[PDB]
Design a protein around this nucleic acid. Structure first.
Ligand code: IHP
Ligand code: MG
Ligand code: ZN
Lengths: 167, 444, 175, 261, 55, 170, 52
RNA sequence: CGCCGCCAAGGUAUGUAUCAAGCUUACAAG
């Protein structure tokens, strides 16, 4: 309800942000409205951290609707924390976090080859999700001030205009 | 490949502003990108975001621009809708044959809804078949089966839906696509299907191949197998797509005439389904001899069961020893039952992916013996066709001739008849060579 | 897959045998409790036997539950009409939905209706309380014959000949 | 081949699948210039398929020849356009499967190809489209090809040059003689004959089709432009005009006598 | 469930959940050891395991 | 009439699709990764054996190939509406970039998908009764005595002043 | 592609004209050249007639 | 002793003249 209010404030109405946080044109935009409607990394990096939290919240709400159980939820959001990048496209707008994508994928191996020690099997079920959760929180630990500042400049330039030949 | 006038002597000596003088020629750069489109656009490297083009169904796994500009000129003039309409009208028009079923009253092409052809998340019924009363339909199975138990809801009307898709080298298996996506729409809740019965037909445009997965009212499956093998063989919209790929790709043949392809059984052998030929003529065979005494009699010496894979050249030669020619009765009349047991034992012995989808026997004496011995394998078609082959002339070549005659056991040997021809020529041409060599040895 | 059922799970089913065939309506008892209590209570009374489907707008709705047959006679088991019970995951996007029929305010009685298609004009105006189990949606598409004679009410409307209760949550007695 | 199938007439019906299969496969062939044999064979046997009750396979190879016209070889594309011309004749224009709404725009950049065979076949086809199918356009499009038919003069074959002036006449009868004529009057200052006498001829064609009094005020006007070529051009166009109209010169002789004096 | 404190704007604009987690570290490490054990015993003894269909 | 199965269990899955499986490619045991795994395994078991020629299959004479899809992930799909078409060569027949232009060079003005979507949502002289409506040469049906009085007025007709030439008929 | 270092061109260009229009513009250009040179020379005997 | 995994701009011009919602205060007032 606020990423959609930026779009309705800028009078776009040919882009559609849907409830799973994608953003899609619907009109083959002509080139005076191709140039007014593109967003930077302050819109898109916030849109994909919200897509990440929308997937985590949808996992817990799938559990508390009661149509998936606790072992299966634990494997669920272990897959979410281990396989972002494949399911959010957040690296695209801020590429330094690709390291942490790899750091999930690296430590996944640590856990996923000690579950499968002994007669346990090479399939899904590794619901030990603390070690990926931690690093995607340590991302947000230092991405709070940066894209808070990026959105500060975005909301300033939207609500008091850009300064042409100031600085 | 391309030959056409890249030298272009004095081209037609035009004026050439600036960017058409010194800029880079995009068109070989994008026909190369079109050419490897299954492996540059494969569906499962990162399996996250994919973007389907409008008016088509191609899905573009990546941000590759040159691939998109290559794959839009060959689906140029609304041609996905055009292939949809062409095949749906061809196989509503193949149901002018109405009374050869139980019956069909009408075949209603439903209202031409645009955007059906590439709406992938939802589907409609495409042509609906009404009936007088009570088609007793089957349970849903592919059209690559044979079993078709056919005991389910006796229903009035029977829809048919047709689906189109595109290649991409990791999902080119539409035996599976038709199954999965039939289930998806028939268990859906946005579906506007008029009956719980009918079939979904999937065809695979790049890598052109077809199947279906619905349930089958009695005289339908062997009808529509031929009825859409003819559509894949010949259809004008699905031919202008073919040649428009060829023209957006700069490929040309280099043969004088059409390479031996017709409505012959030669031609569907090589659709990467495993087909086997089976010769059983020489199971019983008798030597010609004079004894000590002047009398003339017959000796039942050991015979051969030839099983031949035309795509790989593999020749499964089963020996049938002399010593099972004693004790049994009706000796010229029990080989047809003692053959299908051994052939199904061969089916059971081989790996899962190497066993056939279709077996083509010689002159018909084993369709019901193979049907009753293949109870463990429902989905194998047993056919007799008009490519009768002189595998008896294989008993004239000496490496086979001594090995068939001098054996102490049901030995079950393997040979390879395409020696090293597949290094240089195709299965198609090596088969057209082998049947020449065997028929030439046979007649002389 | 990608198909996403997108509506809450049901509880409690009533088979209902009209002259067009057998229709097995399964209820959202938790998501709409008073209306589902009304419907299984009336079906358990055998209130709806010989009741006709007196209004067919083909492609839009087909109404029933009027034992007078004119379009106004409905007597709930609450005495007064009861409240509408909306839900954000129960909307009129498809066929097979079953909903109580209203005349404005919180006025829900016995008179209910099937949908026959998409009915987005009725969102937040009627109480969806059940869907129809598939392979029997075609028996209620038999109910939409173009026979209407008028803006409503065809020649020989289908009557409800029986009404079973295949599963009964929330204990009740008839009258 | 053409004479044989024209003799067999309707008895050639169980051989049209064999022939059309042989031709459609024959039209790939290493690019090895047996593709103008296939396209020429289509142009020769285009006659026998209408009189043998075959329009499905006509609708089948019309759309195929619609996209063999992106060739780089000129002599392949010329026989393609000859075949497509013969199909446009043997079918109606308004009932053909690569319809003229999206066939003529493919032909406007073909028209900038300076090979003589491709030019020749292209404007024969554009002439038949321009008189019999002028409702399949923008009427901007006819204007942006009647600037193409000035460069489609200076073509060393004289059949091109006498077909393009007919196409000016037909374009004019479509869109009116006040836009095509300002084009032909800017063309009169070029320094080149084969390019001014054959636009003078085109002025007489646009005169006599859509009656003079639509060309003759402006053509009378541009004698006042002080250049040698444009003055000899309007006099030569009055020559071809009176030669073409004949007995309608009873009405216009008093209008041009103060010019000729 | 884990109900948790929160801090929301009167306009309903934003809802900050206002708590630092704070676990006792032996009981936390032992709880994760507990479900390492229980979750190995569930992957060993499930007939076939399906994840979530992740959006 | 489709008779119901008459059981109280509801229509669909118990998890309501929360394990939807994406089964649009070749299944797990017949997949090419599994065939590769079979070949790897059987080449590991036969190691001390030296050409015992029992043949075992095609590959096994001595995870790449078509790769397996994640079953548990629906791919997020968009529409790539924006066509790559030279606006010039579409509506003019001439691109200034020649064949170096990065766009298509198409000239077909067929509708887009969204355009199809947003169309998809939407007597007589005396003015009396015909007292012998009777005719002249040229279709003119008049009343009888009224057209006789019309001839007394003017000898030609009323509709287009055509010469009756005395000719008057029923 | 070098989108920076490719030989540029602008959209809607209409292209470089053929030989007839180019050398007609050359003759008009050369006319303006000789007219301004005789204007600078202030020649009083240059006349251009009724036909160029 | 086992690198590697990719978004945006850069092209389909901009500049004028009439015609509503978006957003803006719900005010000073004989
Ligand atoms: O990432 P995915 O391809 O989806 O599969 C990963 C993982 O992949 P990476 O190791 O490339 O990160 C491994 O599978 P492979 O490497 O063999 O493809 C891993 O280790 P194991 O394969 O040894 O288990 C396991 O795969 P598996 O499915 O066998 O558990 C796991 O799978 P998840 O995707 O379920 O984490
Ligand atoms: Mg530039
Ligand atoms: Zn271009």
């Amino acid at each position: 309800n606020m990423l959609n209010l930026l779009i309705h404030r800028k009078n776009l109405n040919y882009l559609h942000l849907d409830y799973n946080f994608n953003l899609k044109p619907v009109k083959t935009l002509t080139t005076k409205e191709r140039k007014k409607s593109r967003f930077g990394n302050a819109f898109h990096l916030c849109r994909e951290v919200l897509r990440l939290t929308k997937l985590v919240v949808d996992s817990h709400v799938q559990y508390r609707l009661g149509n998936v159980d606790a072992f299966q939820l634990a494997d669920g959001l272990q897959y979410i924390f281990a396989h972002v990048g494949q399911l959010t496209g957040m690296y695209r707008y801020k590429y330094k976090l690709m390291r942490q994508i790899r750091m999930c994928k690296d430590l996944k191996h640590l856990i996923y080859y000690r579950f499968n020690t002994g007669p346990v099997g090479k399939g899904p079920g590794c619901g030990f999700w603390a070690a990926g959760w931690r690093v995607w929180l340590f991302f947000m630990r230092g991405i709070t001030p940066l894209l808070e500042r990026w959105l500060g400049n975005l909301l300033a330039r939207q609500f008091e205009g850009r300064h042409s030949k100031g600085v | 490949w391309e030959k056409a006038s890249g030298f272009e002597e004095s081209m037609k000596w035009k004026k050439l502003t600036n960017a058409q003088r010194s800029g880079l020629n995009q068109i070989p750069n994008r026909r190369f990108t079109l050419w490897w489109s299954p492996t540059i656009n494969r569906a499962n490297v990162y399996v996250g975001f994919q973007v389907q083009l409008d008016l088509t169904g191609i899905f573009m796994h990546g941000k590759i621009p040159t691939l998109k500009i290559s794959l839009i000129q060959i689906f140029r003039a609304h041609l996905w809708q055009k292939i949809h309409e062409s095949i749906v009208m061809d196989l509503c028009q193949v149901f002018d044959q109405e009374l050869d079923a139980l019956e069909i009253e009408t075949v209603q092409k439903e209202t031409i809804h645009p955007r059906k052809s590439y709406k992938m998340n939802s589907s409609c019924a495409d042509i609906l078949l009404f009936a007088s009363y009570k088609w007793n339909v089957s349970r849903p199975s592919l059209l690559a089966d044979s079993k078709d138990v056919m005991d389910s809801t006796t229903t009035q009307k029977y829809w048919i839906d047709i689906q189109l898709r595109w290649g991409d080298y990791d999902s080119h298996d539409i035996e599976r696509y038709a199954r999965a996506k039939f289930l998806d729409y028939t268990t859906d809740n946005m579906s506007i299907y008029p009956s719980p019965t009918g079939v979904l037909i999937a065809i695979d445009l790049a890598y052109n191949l077809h199947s279906a997965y619905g349930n089958w009212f009695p005289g339908s499956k062997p009808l529509i197998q031929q009825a859409m093998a003819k559509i894949m063989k010949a259809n004008p919209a699905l031919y202008v797509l073919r040649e428009r790929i060829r023209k957006g790709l700069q490929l040309y043949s280099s043969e004088p005439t059409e390479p031996y392809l017709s409505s012959q059984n030669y031609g569907e052998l090589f659709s990467n389904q495993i087909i086997w030929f089976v010769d059983d003529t020489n199971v019983y065979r008798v030597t010609i001899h004079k004894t000590f005494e002047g009398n003339l009699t017959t000796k039942p010496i050991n015979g051969a069961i030839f099983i031949f894979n035309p795509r790989t050249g593999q020749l499964f030669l089963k020996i049938i020893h002399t010593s099972v020619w004693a004790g049994q009765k009706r000796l010229g009349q029990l080989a047809k039952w003692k053959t299908a047991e051994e052939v199904a034992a061969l089916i059971r012995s081989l790996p899962v992916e190497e066993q056939p989808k279709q077996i083509i026997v010689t002159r018909k004496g084993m369709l019901d013996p193979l049907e009753v011995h293949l109870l463990d394998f429902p989905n194998i078609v047993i056919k007799g066709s008009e490519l009768q082959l002189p595998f008896q002339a294989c008993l004239k070549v000496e490496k086979f001739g001594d090995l068939i005659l001098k054996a102490t056991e049901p030995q079950m040997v393997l040979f390879n008849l395409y020696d090293d021809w597949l290094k240089t020529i195709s299965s198609y041409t090596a088969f057209s060579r082998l049947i020449l060599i065997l028929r030439a040895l046979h007649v002389n | 897959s990608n198909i996403y059922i997108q509506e809450p799970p049901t509880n409690g089913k009533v088979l209902l045998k009209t002259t067009a065939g057998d229709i097995d309506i399964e209820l959202w008892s938790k998501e709409a409790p008073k209306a589902c209590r009304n419907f299984i209570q009336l079906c358990l009374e055998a209130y709806y036997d010989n009741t006709i489907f007196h209004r067919v707008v083909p492609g839009f709705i087909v109404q029933g539950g009027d034992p007078t047959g004119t379009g106004s006679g409905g007597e709930s088991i609450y005495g007064a009409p009861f409240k509408d019970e909306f839900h954000s995951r129960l909307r009129f996007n498809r066929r097979g939905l079953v909903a109580m029929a209203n005349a404005g305010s919180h006025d829900n009685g016995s008179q209910f209706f099937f949908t026959l298609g998409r009915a987005d004009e009725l969102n937040n105006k009627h109480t969806i309380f059940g869907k129809v189990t598939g392979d029997t949606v075609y028996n209620m598409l038999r109910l939409s014959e173009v026979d209407i004679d008028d803006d409503e009410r065809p020649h020989n409307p289908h009557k409800i000949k029986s009404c079973e209760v295949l599963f009964n949550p929330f204990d009740d007695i008839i009258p | 081949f053409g004479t044989v199938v024209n003799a067999l007439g309707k008895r050639v019906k169980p051989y049209l699948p064999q022939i059309c299969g042989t031709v459609l496969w024959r039209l790939n062939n290493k690019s090895a210039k047996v593709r103008q044999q296939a396209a020429d064979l289509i142009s020769r046997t285009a006659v026998v398929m209408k009189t043998c009750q075959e329009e499905k396979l006509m609708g089948h190879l019309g759309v195929v020849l619609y996209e063999y016209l992106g060739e780089e070889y000129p002599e392949v594309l010329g026989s393609i356009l000859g075949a497509l011309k013969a199909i446009v004749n043997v079918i109606g224009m308004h009932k053909m499967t690569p319809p003229i709404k999206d066939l003529l725009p493919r032909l406007t950049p073909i028209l900038k190809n300076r090979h003589e065979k491709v030019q020749e076949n292209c404007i024969d086809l554009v002439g038949r489209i321009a008189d019999r199918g002028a409702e399949y356009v923008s009427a901007r499009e006819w204007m942006r090809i009647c600037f193409e038919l000035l460069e489609l003069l200076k073509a060393h074959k004289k059949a091109i040059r006498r077909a393009t002036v007919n196409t000016f006449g037909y374009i004019a009868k479509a869109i009116g003689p006040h836009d095509v004529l300002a084009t032909l009057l800017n063309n009169l200052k070029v320094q080149e004959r084969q390019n001014r006498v054959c636009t003078t001829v085109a002025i007489a064609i646009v005169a006599e089709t859509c009656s003079p009094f639509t060309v003759l005020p402006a053509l009378m006007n541009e004698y006042r432009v002080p250049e040698l070529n444009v003055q000899n051009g309007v006099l030569k166009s009055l020559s071809f005009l009176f030669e073409y109209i004949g007995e309608m010169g009873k009405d216009y002789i008093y209008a041009v006598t103060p010019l000729l004096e | 469930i884990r109900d948790v404190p929160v801090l929301y704007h009167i306009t309903g604009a934003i809802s900050f959940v206002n708590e630092i987690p704070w676990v006792i570290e032996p009981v936390y490490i032992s709880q994760w050891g507990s479900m390492w054990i229980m979750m190995r015993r569930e992957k060993r003894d499930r007939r076939h395991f399906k994840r979530m269909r992740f959006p | 009439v489709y008779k119901s199965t008459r059981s109280a269990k509801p229509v669909g899955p118990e998890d309501m699709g929360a394990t939807a499986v994406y089964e649009l490619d070749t299944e797990k045991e017949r997949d090419a990764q599994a065939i590769f795994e079979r070949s790897q395994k059987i080449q590991e078991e036969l190691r001390g054996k030296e050409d015992d020629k029992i043949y075992r299959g095609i590959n096994n004479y001595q995870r790449k190939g078509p790769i397996r899809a994640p079953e548990h992930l629906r791919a997020t799909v968009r529409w790539d509406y924006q066509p790559d078409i030279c606006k010039d060569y579409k509506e003019t027949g001439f691109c200034g970039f020649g064949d170096s232009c990065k766009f298509l060079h198409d000239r077909s003005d067929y509708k887009h998908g969204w355009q199809i979507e947003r169309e998809l949502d939407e007597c007589f002289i005396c003015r009396q009764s015909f007292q012998n409506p009777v005719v002249t040469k040229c279709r003119h049906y008049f009343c009888e005595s009224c057209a006789l009085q019309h001839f007394r007025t003017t000898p030609r007709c009323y509709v287009c002043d055509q010469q009756t030439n005395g000719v008057f008929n029923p | 592609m070098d989108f920076q270092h490719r030989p540029g061109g602008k959209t809607g260009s209409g292209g470089v004209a053929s030989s007839s229009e180019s050398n007609r513009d050359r003759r008009e250009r050369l006319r303006q050249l000789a007219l301004e040179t005789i204007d600078i020379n202030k020649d009083p005997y240059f006349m251009k007639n009724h036909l160029g």
